[PDB]
Amino acid sequence: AQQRSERYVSARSQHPAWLLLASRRAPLVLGCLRTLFEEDALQALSEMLAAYASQATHLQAGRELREWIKRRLVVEREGRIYATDALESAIQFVDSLDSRIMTSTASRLSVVQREIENLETGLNPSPTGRIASLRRRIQDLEHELARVEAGHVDVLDEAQAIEGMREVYNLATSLRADFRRVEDSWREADRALRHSIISEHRGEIVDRLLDGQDALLNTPEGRVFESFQQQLRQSAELEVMRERLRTILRHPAVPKALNRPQQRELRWLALRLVRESQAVLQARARSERDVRGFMKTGLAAEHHRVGQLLNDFFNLALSVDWQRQSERRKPACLPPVGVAITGVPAIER
Amino acid sequence: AQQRSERYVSARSQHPAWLLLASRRAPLVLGCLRTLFEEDALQALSEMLAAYASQATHLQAGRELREWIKRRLVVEREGRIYATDALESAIQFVDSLDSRIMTSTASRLSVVQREIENLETGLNPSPTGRIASLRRRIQDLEHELARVEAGHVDVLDEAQAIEGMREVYNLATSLRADFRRVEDSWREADRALRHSIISEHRGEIVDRLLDGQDALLNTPEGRVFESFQQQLRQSAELEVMRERLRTILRHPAVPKALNRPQQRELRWLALRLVRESQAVLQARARSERDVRGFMKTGLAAEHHRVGQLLNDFFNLALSVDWQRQSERRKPACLPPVGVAITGVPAIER
Amino acid sequence: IWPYPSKKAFLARLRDYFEVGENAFTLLNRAAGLKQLNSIDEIFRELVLDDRSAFERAAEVASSFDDLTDIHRELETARKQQRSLQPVADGWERYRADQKTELAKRMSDALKADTGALAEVGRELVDVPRYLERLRVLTEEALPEKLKRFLEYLNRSSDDGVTQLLSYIDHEVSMIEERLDDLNSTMQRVDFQPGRYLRLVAKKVIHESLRTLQHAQRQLNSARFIDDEGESHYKALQALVGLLKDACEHSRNQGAKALLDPRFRLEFAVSVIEKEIIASYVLTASLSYALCPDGSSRPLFGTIVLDQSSHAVAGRIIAALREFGLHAVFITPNKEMRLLRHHTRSAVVVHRRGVESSLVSLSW
């Protein structure tokens, strides 16, 4: 019980999402960032911060943007800004305060029961139990078919139909939750690999890594994403799912269950899923290519020794008197590099 | 796009959960409240606020408790404190920052596909397509049985087993999400009914409501909860679910998928679900009984009249000079009520 | 060299180079073409102090209130519809216990107040359930949502709207008083008369509009403790918003400017603990205070421009300028070329011939 409070305090101090939520300008920052991912970031942030004085804009806009970049809420790669998982967690929390779909329903209970049955029968190696389960399910389906042949077709009521539609939307919309998480997982592996290469720099490690064709940057989330995207490619079931969704969306009870944006999201589910899954493998390939290029450049030892020398110089610099203009202007010991020759004074000759 | 920022600002200003998260003492309040729901609130809050000075006590503890009561983060019924939905939403957000189960997996995709198929076949009233679907499913099950009879029993791998266990836990733990939401829905209906009775007070409305035996306090969440708890009572499937859960929890891969608290939560799922569902109907019954008692007391007209008179007096009181001691001590006109005897008959003996 | 294709960044860099505030150059421009030394209150309220009126926020507050009135109207319409629909539900219970005429009358009354929900519904007994369903939709879904939105808008408008404006005005008045105290402090190091120095005193003024505004504010504060689902609070806020609207409508009156302009909420007086000399002393002290980095007494920017009185009248202005440490450039027609020869030691002459002008700089 005591450790929970310490964990909460640590999360409050460190985690980017809670810091963003507790920030002074949280609502406008959240709105602007969410609009963006749907210089230019700095310009739009300044524009939004302009007509919200209430409660020198361009200076504080840049200061806050660099503060969030430091906190790793957003990431800067070369000259571009990319979103992380903390931003999406904050957005999900904020925009769920208005409308949240209930999960204490009968449909969710039936789904849970069927899923538990499926898992339990899938973990069983004995063949006799499998045969018994198959026979029981076949008999139940045959009984239902016999009942239906007598003219007892069952149709969900309006309330049950609305409940089912909302539950299906809630389950289907959760497949995009962890797309940024995989990329965040790969970036830290990249950083750790580069740090290990620099601190080691031994050329044998670099040569061995370059020689092998086995891919680097392996993480637990990457394997889960690979397993997901492999099954995503089996179009023989994606087509059936899309057709069933199209059939479902043409029902009288749809307007009372979902509004326009939700209907749009359910309408283009498969296309958007495939399109967004294809945009993560490219990021992984780019990361691996950049790592291999950095390794092939071969300037790690220079970085290490220049860092050591800079640390020595900075340690020494604390023992001099910077308050005297005489010492601040004393000539140092550094050679001329990139000498630009004096213009010949012929001028007009 | 512009309206989203306004909505975010309104939610920041008004919603209790965001206010709690943005408060100064948020981690301590969250920890103490979560420990409690697992006068005395004042003592525990003061104790926890004591050894965290860093960064009176009892006065500020009381001020904080009354501030959160005013903001409706918690409710005070007679002499006790009860939790609301905002507190649980904030707790869920805070403790999801450490470990969150992935939903971009293959098991979730399979569940979504099966659920979509079931829903789509549920809304179809034609007696011809249903027979076709039944025959197709029976044929597929027969083919799988034929394959299994040849000695091709399929068993999930270790990674697939872990993924399935984590997904089952994630789906099953979501059945308790909206238990406080129903009670919050009933409380506001009670409050609105009492306000309408007072503002009307017409005796015909009260007599008509008292005469009828039809239950009051009807809300959309109440009907969903009733439908859920009706199916919860069919023990013929609860026993099977509990037995399957017990069978699942005895697997070698369990320690690598779930830790001890998660195994405990999955172990006692059905008992806790039934026990917590039985504790909401009693709250509804208490609310209805209290409303009927208030209606039977018959003092609404007096409340309305005294409110009007107090408003008139308070409006008049703004036009006198309270800065003069002469006027503050000027005798008013109010009769002696509850006259005690003059101490004694002045005969001590 | 530093080029700027933008006056905003150029002026920011300029104000950073000479460690001055954001209003020093504006004040220098105001006192560089001032025609006549008017009354002390007028001079201090028009030249030394800068315009920071709140006429802009009042329009936004009024617009927000006008937006809130629509939500209030929607809530009232919903309540009116429910009150009309309830007797139909009572009549159906009576019928299930002739009375068809009364039920038809009630259904007609219900249809009278409808706004499209009961578009095409007759008085047939088969239509009675339809009415009932509508009533349920009013009781459980529409009214709670409308009430919640109305309460949220009311609280936000009452807290982030009219409440912060008056606090801002009071804060501006406090800042003016503090700056006046600082100016009095920096004006002590001078002798207007032998062993005598000036002092500035600020006194709050009173007005009928101010009293009405304060009484309305007290009513708004007192109306928040009632439990009427926000009706009394809305009524109390309406009068205050109306007062602000009336003040903002005519922004060229003493009463209206006494509400939304902080500079008109004070009256200034001068003590000798002469009008031209006093005005010049106050203007010079203000200029010296503006052109001085905090914690320092030596200006980095020294040149100022002045216009324009016997020899003794102007003999003290030069002494004050030299004491405060400011360099001066005077503008004067060919009228006072007798005393400037004694103080100024150079001259710039402008000759106009046709549509062209030439400058010649010469000493005396």
mmCIF file of N, CA and C in Angstrom, chain A residues 2 4-5 7-9 15 18 21 34-35 52 85 93-94 97-98 100 102-106 108 113 115 117 119-120 125 127 130 134 138 141 145 153-154 163 167-168 171 174-175 177-178 181 224 228 231 237 244 247-248, chain B residues 2 4 7-8 15 18 21 27 34-35 48 52 85 93-94 97-98 100 102-106 108 110 113 115 117 119-120 125 130-131 134 138 141 145 153-154 163 167-168 171 174-175 177-178 181 224 228 231 237 244 247-248:
data_model
loop_
_atom_site.group_PDB
_atom_site.id
_atom_site.type_symbol
_atom_site.label_atom_id
_atom_site.label_comp_id
_atom_site.label_asym_id
_atom_site.label_seq_id
_atom_site.Cartn_x
_atom_site.Cartn_y
_atom_site.Cartn_z
ATOM 1 N N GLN A 2 1.956 1.212 0.765
ATOM 2 C CA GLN A 2 2.869 2.349 0.808
ATOM 3 C C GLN A 2 3.593 2.526 -0.520
ATOM 4 N N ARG A 4 2.546 1.934 -3.466
ATOM 5 C CA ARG A 4 1.683 2.479 -4.507
ATOM 6 C C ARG A 4 1.772 3.999 -4.557
ATOM 7 N N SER A 5 1.819 4.650 -3.393
ATOM 8 C CA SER A 5 1.945 6.103 -3.365
ATOM 9 C C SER A 5 3.269 6.553 -3.970
ATOM 10 N N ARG A 7 4.981 4.937 -6.249
ATOM 11 C CA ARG A 7 4.856 4.731 -7.688
ATOM 12 C C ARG A 7 4.051 5.850 -8.334
ATOM 13 N N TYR A 8 2.963 6.271 -7.685
ATOM 14 C CA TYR A 8 2.156 7.359 -8.227
ATOM 15 C C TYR A 8 2.947 8.659 -8.280
ATOM 16 N N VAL A 9 3.733 8.943 -7.239
ATOM 17 C CA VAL A 9 4.535 10.164 -7.230
ATOM 18 C C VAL A 9 5.589 10.121 -8.330
ATOM 19 N N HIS A 15 6.417 10.632 -15.998
ATOM 20 C CA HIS A 15 5.725 10.204 -17.208
ATOM 21 C C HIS A 15 5.249 11.407 -18.015
ATOM 22 N N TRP A 18 1.086 12.435 -17.883
ATOM 23 C CA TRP A 18 0.603 13.149 -16.708
ATOM 24 C C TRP A 18 1.149 14.570 -16.660
ATOM 25 N N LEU A 21 -0.951 16.578 -19.049
ATOM 26 C CA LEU A 21 -2.279 16.844 -18.508
ATOM 27 C C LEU A 21 -2.232 17.903 -17.414
ATOM 28 N N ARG A 34 -3.519 17.505 -31.652
ATOM 29 C CA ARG A 34 -4.444 16.553 -32.252
ATOM 30 C C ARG A 34 -4.855 16.992 -33.651
ATOM 31 N N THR A 35 -5.059 18.297 -33.854
ATOM 32 C CA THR A 35 -5.389 18.779 -35.190
ATOM 33 C C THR A 35 -4.232 18.561 -36.158
ATOM 34 N N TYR A 52 -5.882 33.383 -27.447
ATOM 35 C CA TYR A 52 -6.295 32.760 -26.198
ATOM 36 C C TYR A 52 -5.615 33.420 -25.006
ATOM 37 N N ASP A 85 3.435 7.383 -27.985
ATOM 38 C CA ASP A 85 2.316 6.695 -27.351
ATOM 39 C C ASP A 85 1.709 7.503 -26.212
ATOM 40 N N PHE A 93 -7.651 9.435 -23.080
ATOM 41 C CA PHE A 93 -8.251 9.759 -21.790
ATOM 42 C C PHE A 93 -9.130 10.999 -21.883
ATOM 43 N N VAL A 94 -8.654 12.037 -22.574
ATOM 44 C CA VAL A 94 -9.369 13.309 -22.592
ATOM 45 C C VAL A 94 -10.680 13.184 -23.356
ATOM 46 N N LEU A 97 -14.010 11.430 -21.867
ATOM 47 C CA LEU A 97 -14.790 12.047 -20.803
ATOM 48 C C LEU A 97 -16.192 12.427 -21.252
ATOM 49 N N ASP A 98 -16.427 12.531 -22.558
ATOM 50 C CA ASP A 98 -17.734 12.925 -23.072
ATOM 51 C C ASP A 98 -18.656 11.723 -23.246
ATOM 52 N N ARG A 100 -18.530 7.406 -23.340
ATOM 53 C CA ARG A 100 -17.841 6.133 -23.201
ATOM 54 C C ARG A 100 -18.857 5.011 -23.346
ATOM 55 N N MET A 102 -20.546 1.510 -22.795
ATOM 56 C CA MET A 102 -20.609 0.603 -21.659
ATOM 57 C C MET A 102 -20.071 -0.772 -22.025
ATOM 58 N N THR A 103 -19.351 -1.385 -21.086
ATOM 59 C CA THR A 103 -18.861 -2.743 -21.246
ATOM 60 C C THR A 103 -19.517 -3.731 -20.294
ATOM 61 N N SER A 104 -20.333 -3.260 -19.352
ATOM 62 C CA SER A 104 -21.106 -4.139 -18.475
ATOM 63 C C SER A 104 -22.453 -4.444 -19.130
ATOM 64 N N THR A 105 -22.385 -5.227 -20.201
ATOM 65 C CA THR A 105 -23.552 -5.578 -20.992
ATOM 66 C C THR A 105 -23.636 -7.091 -21.130
ATOM 67 N N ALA A 106 -24.740 -7.554 -21.716
ATOM 68 C CA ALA A 106 -24.920 -8.983 -21.940
ATOM 69 C C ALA A 106 -24.098 -9.475 -23.125
ATOM 70 N N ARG A 108 -21.139 -8.393 -24.133
ATOM 71 C CA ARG A 108 -19.764 -8.586 -23.693
ATOM 72 C C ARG A 108 -19.626 -9.862 -22.875
ATOM 73 N N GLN A 113 -17.623 -15.441 -22.559
ATOM 74 C CA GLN A 113 -17.845 -16.871 -22.366
ATOM 75 C C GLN A 113 -17.381 -17.672 -23.579
ATOM 76 N N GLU A 115 -15.150 -16.807 -25.846
ATOM 77 C CA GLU A 115 -13.697 -16.730 -25.955
ATOM 78 C C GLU A 115 -13.010 -17.640 -24.944
ATOM 79 N N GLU A 117 -14.271 -20.393 -23.658
ATOM 80 C CA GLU A 117 -14.456 -21.754 -24.155
ATOM 81 C C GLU A 117 -13.452 -22.074 -25.252
ATOM 82 N N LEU A 119 -10.467 -20.710 -25.921
ATOM 83 C CA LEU A 119 -9.107 -20.851 -25.407
ATOM 84 C C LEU A 119 -8.929 -22.165 -24.657
ATOM 85 N N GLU A 120 -9.884 -22.503 -23.788
ATOM 86 C CA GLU A 120 -9.757 -23.711 -22.984
ATOM 87 C C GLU A 120 -9.728 -24.954 -23.860
ATOM 88 N N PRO A 125 -4.433 -30.906 -25.226
ATOM 89 C CA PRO A 125 -3.807 -31.790 -26.220
ATOM 90 C C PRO A 125 -4.526 -33.114 -26.429
ATOM 91 N N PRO A 127 -6.843 -36.010 -27.574
ATOM 92 C CA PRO A 127 -7.731 -36.090 -28.743
ATOM 93 C C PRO A 127 -9.164 -36.466 -28.394
ATOM 94 N N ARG A 130 -11.175 -33.435 -27.606
ATOM 95 C CA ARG A 130 -11.455 -32.697 -28.832
ATOM 96 C C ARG A 130 -12.599 -33.337 -29.606
ATOM 97 N N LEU A 134 -16.187 -31.544 -30.398
ATOM 98 C CA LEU A 134 -16.667 -31.404 -31.768
ATOM 99 C C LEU A 134 -18.039 -32.041 -31.935
ATOM 100 N N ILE A 138 -21.460 -30.017 -32.937
ATOM 101 C CA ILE A 138 -22.197 -30.419 -34.131
ATOM 102 C C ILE A 138 -23.637 -30.764 -33.775
ATOM 103 N N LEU A 141 -25.585 -27.523 -33.152
ATOM 104 C CA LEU A 141 -25.903 -26.848 -34.406
ATOM 105 C C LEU A 141 -27.008 -27.579 -35.159
ATOM 106 N N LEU A 145 -30.620 -26.110 -36.274
ATOM 107 C CA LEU A 145 -31.106 -26.217 -37.647
ATOM 108 C C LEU A 145 -32.484 -26.865 -37.694
ATOM 109 N N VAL A 153 -37.223 -18.637 -36.842
ATOM 110 C CA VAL A 153 -36.077 -17.762 -37.053
ATOM 111 C C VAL A 153 -36.064 -16.679 -35.983
ATOM 112 N N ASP A 154 -34.943 -16.561 -35.279
ATOM 113 C CA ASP A 154 -34.787 -15.591 -34.203
ATOM 114 C C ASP A 154 -34.096 -14.344 -34.736
ATOM 115 N N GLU A 163 -27.225 -2.590 -28.886
ATOM 116 C CA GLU A 163 -26.161 -3.043 -27.996
ATOM 117 C C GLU A 163 -25.079 -3.782 -28.774
ATOM 118 N N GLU A 167 -21.174 -2.601 -29.235
ATOM 119 C CA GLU A 167 -20.100 -3.472 -28.769
ATOM 120 C C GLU A 167 -19.149 -3.843 -29.899
ATOM 121 N N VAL A 168 -19.683 -4.112 -31.094
ATOM 122 C CA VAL A 168 -18.827 -4.427 -32.235
ATOM 123 C C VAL A 168 -17.943 -3.239 -32.580
ATOM 124 N N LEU A 171 -15.149 -3.040 -29.917
ATOM 125 C CA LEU A 171 -14.117 -4.059 -30.092
ATOM 126 C C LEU A 171 -13.269 -3.793 -31.329
ATOM 127 N N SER A 174 -10.371 -0.972 -31.385
ATOM 128 C CA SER A 174 -9.222 -1.136 -30.506
ATOM 129 C C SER A 174 -8.022 -1.774 -31.192
ATOM 130 N N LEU A 175 -8.120 -2.091 -32.483
ATOM 131 C CA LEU A 175 -7.026 -2.736 -33.196
ATOM 132 C C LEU A 175 -5.896 -1.781 -33.555
ATOM 133 N N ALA A 177 -4.603 0.487 -31.361
ATOM 134 C CA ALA A 177 -4.154 1.116 -30.125
ATOM 135 C C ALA A 177 -2.633 1.201 -30.046
ATOM 136 N N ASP A 178 -1.930 0.159 -30.489
ATOM 137 C CA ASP A 178 -0.509 0.008 -30.204
ATOM 138 C C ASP A 178 0.374 0.158 -31.439
ATOM 139 N N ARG A 181 3.310 2.410 -30.238
ATOM 140 C CA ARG A 181 4.082 1.717 -29.219
ATOM 141 C C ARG A 181 5.218 0.903 -29.822
ATOM 142 N N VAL A 224 5.042 -9.480 -31.731
ATOM 143 C CA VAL A 224 3.584 -9.447 -31.688
ATOM 144 C C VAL A 224 3.035 -8.734 -32.914
ATOM 145 N N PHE A 228 0.626 -10.235 -35.876
ATOM 146 C CA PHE A 228 -0.628 -9.580 -36.240
ATOM 147 C C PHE A 228 -0.683 -9.269 -37.731
ATOM 148 N N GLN A 231 -1.245 -12.301 -40.214
ATOM 149 C CA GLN A 231 -2.633 -12.713 -40.371
ATOM 150 C C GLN A 231 -3.475 -11.631 -41.027
ATOM 151 N N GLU A 237 -10.280 -13.742 -45.818
ATOM 152 C CA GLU A 237 -11.185 -13.418 -44.725
ATOM 153 C C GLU A 237 -11.429 -11.925 -44.584
ATOM 154 N N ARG A 244 -19.432 -8.270 -44.735
ATOM 155 C CA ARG A 244 -20.335 -8.349 -43.593
ATOM 156 C C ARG A 244 -20.526 -6.985 -42.944
ATOM 157 N N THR A 247 -22.919 -5.078 -45.101
ATOM 158 C CA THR A 247 -24.279 -5.557 -44.870
ATOM 159 C C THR A 247 -24.834 -5.030 -43.552
ATOM 160 N N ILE A 248 -24.012 -5.021 -42.501
ATOM 161 C CA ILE A 248 -24.472 -4.573 -41.188
ATOM 162 C C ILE A 248 -24.833 -3.094 -41.217
ATOM 163 N N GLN B 2 -12.348 23.895 -34.438
ATOM 164 C CA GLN B 2 -12.380 24.947 -33.428
ATOM 165 C C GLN B 2 -13.202 24.526 -32.216
ATOM 166 N N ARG B 4 -13.558 21.630 -30.949
ATOM 167 C CA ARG B 4 -12.869 20.650 -30.116
ATOM 168 C C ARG B 4 -12.073 21.329 -29.009
ATOM 169 N N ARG B 7 -14.464 22.424 -26.339
ATOM 170 C CA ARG B 7 -14.886 21.270 -25.554
ATOM 171 C C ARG B 7 -13.801 20.845 -24.575
ATOM 172 N N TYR B 8 -12.544 20.848 -25.019
ATOM 173 C CA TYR B 8 -11.446 20.482 -24.132
ATOM 174 C C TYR B 8 -11.316 21.468 -22.979
ATOM 175 N N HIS B 15 -14.982 19.008 -15.496
ATOM 176 C CA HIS B 15 -15.036 17.587 -15.176
ATOM 177 C C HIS B 15 -14.198 17.278 -13.938
ATOM 178 N N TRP B 18 -10.374 15.412 -14.474
ATOM 179 C CA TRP B 18 -9.264 16.254 -14.901
ATOM 180 C C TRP B 18 -8.849 17.222 -13.801
ATOM 181 N N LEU B 21 -6.741 15.236 -11.405
ATOM 182 C CA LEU B 21 -5.417 14.955 -11.950
ATOM 183 C C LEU B 21 -4.538 16.199 -11.946
ATOM 184 N N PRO B 27 -1.238 12.919 -6.319
ATOM 185 C CA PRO B 27 -0.781 11.551 -6.011
ATOM 186 C C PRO B 27 -1.202 11.061 -4.636
ATOM 187 N N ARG B 34 -7.744 5.366 -3.038
ATOM 188 C CA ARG B 34 -7.739 3.999 -3.543
ATOM 189 C C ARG B 34 -7.532 2.997 -2.417
ATOM 190 N N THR B 35 -6.703 3.340 -1.428
ATOM 191 C CA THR B 35 -6.545 2.456 -0.276
ATOM 192 C C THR B 35 -7.838 2.355 0.524
ATOM 193 N N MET B 48 -1.721 10.746 5.986
ATOM 194 C CA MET B 48 -0.919 10.660 4.769
ATOM 195 C C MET B 48 -0.332 12.016 4.391
ATOM 196 N N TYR B 52 4.505 14.033 4.367
ATOM 197 C CA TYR B 52 4.825 14.385 2.990
ATOM 198 C C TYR B 52 5.011 15.888 2.839
ATOM 199 N N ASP B 85 -17.918 7.595 -10.534
ATOM 200 C CA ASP B 85 -17.281 7.063 -11.735
ATOM 201 C C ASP B 85 -16.023 7.833 -12.110
ATOM 202 N N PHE B 93 -6.822 5.406 -15.476
ATOM 203 C CA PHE B 93 -5.834 6.098 -16.295
ATOM 204 C C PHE B 93 -4.469 6.107 -15.621
ATOM 205 N N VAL B 94 -4.435 6.370 -14.314
ATOM 206 C CA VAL B 94 -3.161 6.482 -13.613
ATOM 207 C C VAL B 94 -2.441 5.139 -13.579
ATOM 208 N N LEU B 97 -0.591 3.520 -16.754
ATOM 209 C CA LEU B 97 0.672 4.059 -17.238
ATOM 210 C C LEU B 97 1.824 3.079 -17.080
ATOM 211 N N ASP B 98 1.732 2.148 -16.132
ATOM 212 C CA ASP B 98 2.822 1.213 -15.874
ATOM 213 C C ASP B 98 2.809 0.046 -16.857
ATOM 214 N N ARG B 100 0.244 -1.873 -19.738
ATOM 215 C CA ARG B 100 -0.980 -1.937 -20.522
ATOM 216 C C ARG B 100 -0.885 -3.116 -21.479
ATOM 217 N N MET B 102 -1.454 -5.237 -24.735
ATOM 218 C CA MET B 102 -1.614 -4.886 -26.139
ATOM 219 C C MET B 102 -2.924 -5.426 -26.692
ATOM 220 N N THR B 103 -3.562 -4.633 -27.552
ATOM 221 C CA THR B 103 -4.770 -5.052 -28.244
ATOM 222 C C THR B 103 -4.577 -5.197 -29.746
ATOM 223 N N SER B 104 -3.418 -4.810 -30.278
ATOM 224 C CA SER B 104 -3.092 -5.032 -31.687
ATOM 225 C C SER B 104 -2.414 -6.394 -31.836
ATOM 226 N N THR B 105 -3.213 -7.436 -31.635
ATOM 227 C CA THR B 105 -2.737 -8.808 -31.672
ATOM 228 C C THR B 105 -3.589 -9.615 -32.641
ATOM 229 N N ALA B 106 -3.173 -10.861 -32.872
ATOM 230 C CA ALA B 106 -3.931 -11.750 -33.743
ATOM 231 C C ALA B 106 -5.170 -12.307 -33.056
ATOM 232 N N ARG B 108 -7.090 -10.808 -30.826
ATOM 233 C CA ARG B 108 -8.130 -9.790 -30.879
ATOM 234 C C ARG B 108 -8.748 -9.712 -32.267
ATOM 235 N N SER B 110 -9.039 -12.218 -34.419
ATOM 236 C CA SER B 110 -9.917 -13.375 -34.566
ATOM 237 C C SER B 110 -11.222 -13.174 -33.807
ATOM 238 N N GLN B 113 -13.414 -10.781 -35.764
ATOM 239 C CA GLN B 113 -14.018 -11.400 -36.942
ATOM 240 C C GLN B 113 -15.174 -12.316 -36.557
ATOM 241 N N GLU B 115 -17.013 -12.212 -33.821
ATOM 242 C CA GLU B 115 -18.106 -11.406 -33.291
ATOM 243 C C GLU B 115 -18.869 -10.700 -34.406
ATOM 244 N N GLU B 117 -19.145 -11.752 -37.509
ATOM 245 C CA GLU B 117 -19.935 -12.784 -38.174
ATOM 246 C C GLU B 117 -21.205 -13.088 -37.393
ATOM 247 N N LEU B 119 -22.845 -11.204 -35.167
ATOM 248 C CA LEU B 119 -23.792 -10.095 -35.223
ATOM 249 C C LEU B 119 -24.475 -10.019 -36.580
ATOM 250 N N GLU B 120 -23.708 -10.162 -37.661
ATOM 251 C CA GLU B 120 -24.286 -10.052 -38.994
ATOM 252 C C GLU B 120 -25.307 -11.152 -39.242
ATOM 253 N N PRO B 125 -33.292 -11.757 -41.013
ATOM 254 C CA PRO B 125 -34.546 -12.473 -40.760
ATOM 255 C C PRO B 125 -34.908 -13.520 -41.800
ATOM 256 N N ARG B 130 -30.146 -18.434 -43.262
ATOM 257 C CA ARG B 130 -29.796 -19.029 -41.977
ATOM 258 C C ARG B 130 -29.482 -20.513 -42.126
ATOM 259 N N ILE B 131 -30.281 -21.228 -42.920
ATOM 260 C CA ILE B 131 -30.026 -22.647 -43.149
ATOM 261 C C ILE B 131 -28.695 -22.838 -43.861
ATOM 262 N N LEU B 134 -25.928 -22.358 -41.293
ATOM 263 C CA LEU B 134 -25.875 -23.511 -40.400
ATOM 264 C C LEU B 134 -25.224 -24.704 -41.085
ATOM 265 N N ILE B 138 -21.739 -26.521 -39.943
ATOM 266 C CA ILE B 138 -21.749 -27.949 -39.635
ATOM 267 C C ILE B 138 -20.741 -28.688 -40.505
ATOM 268 N N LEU B 141 -17.205 -27.979 -39.217
ATOM 269 C CA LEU B 141 -16.926 -28.742 -38.004
ATOM 270 C C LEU B 141 -16.712 -30.218 -38.318
ATOM 271 N N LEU B 145 -13.409 -32.434 -37.572
ATOM 272 C CA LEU B 145 -13.483 -33.712 -36.869
ATOM 273 C C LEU B 145 -12.810 -34.820 -37.669
ATOM 274 N N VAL B 153 -4.228 -33.383 -33.899
ATOM 275 C CA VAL B 153 -4.658 -32.470 -32.847
ATOM 276 C C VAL B 153 -3.739 -31.260 -32.817
ATOM 277 N N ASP B 154 -4.331 -30.071 -32.873
ATOM 278 C CA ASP B 154 -3.590 -28.818 -32.880
ATOM 279 C C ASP B 154 -3.548 -28.239 -31.474
ATOM 280 N N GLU B 163 -0.396 -15.086 -25.356
ATOM 281 C CA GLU B 163 -1.228 -14.056 -25.967
ATOM 282 C C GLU B 163 -2.701 -14.292 -25.656
ATOM 283 N N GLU B 167 -5.148 -11.842 -23.447
ATOM 284 C CA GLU B 167 -6.349 -11.282 -24.058
ATOM 285 C C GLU B 167 -7.604 -11.679 -23.290
ATOM 286 N N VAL B 168 -7.677 -12.930 -22.825
ATOM 287 C CA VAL B 168 -8.829 -13.361 -22.038
ATOM 288 C C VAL B 168 -8.920 -12.564 -20.748
ATOM 289 N N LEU B 171 -10.209 -9.018 -21.619
ATOM 290 C CA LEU B 171 -11.638 -8.985 -21.916
ATOM 291 C C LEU B 171 -12.477 -9.232 -20.668
ATOM 292 N N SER B 174 -13.086 -6.369 -17.886
ATOM 293 C CA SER B 174 -13.817 -5.169 -18.269
ATOM 294 C C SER B 174 -15.297 -5.225 -17.917
ATOM 295 N N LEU B 175 -15.766 -6.309 -17.301
ATOM 296 C CA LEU B 175 -17.177 -6.447 -16.966
ATOM 297 C C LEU B 175 -17.591 -5.626 -15.753
ATOM 298 N N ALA B 177 -16.664 -2.388 -15.288
ATOM 299 C CA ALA B 177 -16.302 -1.001 -15.555
ATOM 300 C C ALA B 177 -17.396 -0.030 -15.128
ATOM 301 N N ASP B 178 -18.661 -0.379 -15.359
ATOM 302 C CA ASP B 178 -19.761 0.572 -15.268
ATOM 303 C C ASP B 178 -20.700 0.294 -14.097
ATOM 304 N N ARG B 181 -21.306 3.786 -12.536
ATOM 305 C CA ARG B 181 -22.007 4.649 -13.478
ATOM 306 C C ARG B 181 -23.517 4.537 -13.313
ATOM 307 N N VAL B 224 -29.925 -1.403 -19.243
ATOM 308 C CA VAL B 224 -28.774 -2.202 -19.654
ATOM 309 C C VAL B 224 -28.281 -3.056 -18.495
ATOM 310 N N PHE B 228 -28.125 -7.145 -18.221
ATOM 311 C CA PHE B 228 -26.885 -7.835 -17.875
ATOM 312 C C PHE B 228 -27.078 -8.761 -16.678
ATOM 313 N N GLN B 231 -29.088 -12.120 -17.268
ATOM 314 C CA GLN B 231 -28.305 -13.210 -17.833
ATOM 315 C C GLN B 231 -27.216 -13.677 -16.881
ATOM 316 N N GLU B 237 -24.547 -21.837 -17.028
ATOM 317 C CA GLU B 237 -23.362 -21.466 -17.786
ATOM 318 C C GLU B 237 -22.272 -20.859 -16.917
ATOM 319 N N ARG B 244 -14.061 -23.997 -16.518
ATOM 320 C CA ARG B 244 -13.096 -23.765 -17.587
ATOM 321 C C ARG B 244 -11.982 -22.834 -17.131
ATOM 322 N N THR B 247 -9.643 -24.874 -15.041
ATOM 323 C CA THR B 247 -8.813 -25.711 -15.902
ATOM 324 C C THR B 247 -7.715 -24.893 -16.573
ATOM 325 N N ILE B 248 -8.048 -23.690 -17.043
ATOM 326 C CA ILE B 248 -7.072 -22.855 -17.737
ATOM 327 C C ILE B 248 -5.950 -22.437 -16.797
#
